[PDB]
Amino acid sequence: APTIIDLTCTVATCTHSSDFGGVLTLTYKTDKNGDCSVHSHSNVATLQE
Amino acid sequence: YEHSTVMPNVVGFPYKAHIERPGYSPLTLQMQVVETSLEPTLNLEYITC
User: Fold this and answer.
1) Phi–psi pair at B43, nearest 5 degrees
2) Which of residues 20-39 of A touch B (CB under 8 A)?
3) Best residue in A11, A13, A17 for a mutation probing chain B (most B CBs within 10 Å)
4) Closest by alpha carbon to B1, among B28, B17, B20?
5) Within 13 A of A8's CA, how many CA atoms are on the CB side?
6) CA–CA separation, A46 vs A34, rounded Å?
7) How far apart, in whole angstroms, are the C-alpha atoms of residue A21 and residue B24?
8) Contact status, residue A47 vs residue A21, Cβ threshold 8 Å
9) B38 and B11 in contact (C-beta within 8 Å)?
10) How far apart are alpha carbons B30 and A25 in whole angstroms?
11) Could you give the C-alpha distances from B39 to A30, B36, B42, B43, in angstroms and in order?
12) CA–CA distance, B10 with B12 (Å, rounded to integer)
């Protein structure tokens, strides 16, 4: 697994609609390229992927 | 998306309207008055010669 350090998130746009109406940008630092899993830890917002 | 503005009644003045929709990048559209005409409603009383 890749090691991820110093990660922050900023919200580009948000609109509380029925569809997926908000978009997130995450900044990170990694040692290798890889495929690994993202999650949200509340039901106030639902991710798509 | 509905928008409303007010533009001066001047021939040749370059009016530019700025639309800022929450989910999209801002848009600027240009309106210009090429020509104008104002006609009264006339009812003939008589003629002379």
Assistant:
1) -125, 125
2) 21
3) A13
4) B20
5) 2
6) 24
7) 11
8) no
9) no
10) 33
11) 73, 10, 9, 13
12) 6
Residue whose structure tokens are 């900023």: A10
Resolution for this PDB entry, in angstroms: 3.0
Method of elucidation: cryo-EM
Residue B48 tokens read as 């002379």
Q: Return the HEC string of A3-39.
A: CCEEEEEEEEEECCCCCCCEEEEEEEECCCCCCCCCC
Q: How close A13 gets to chain B, by Cα (Å)?
A: 6
The residue type at B17: A
Q: And the tokens for B47? A: 């003629």
User: Any chain A CB within 8 A of the CB of B22?
Assistant: yes
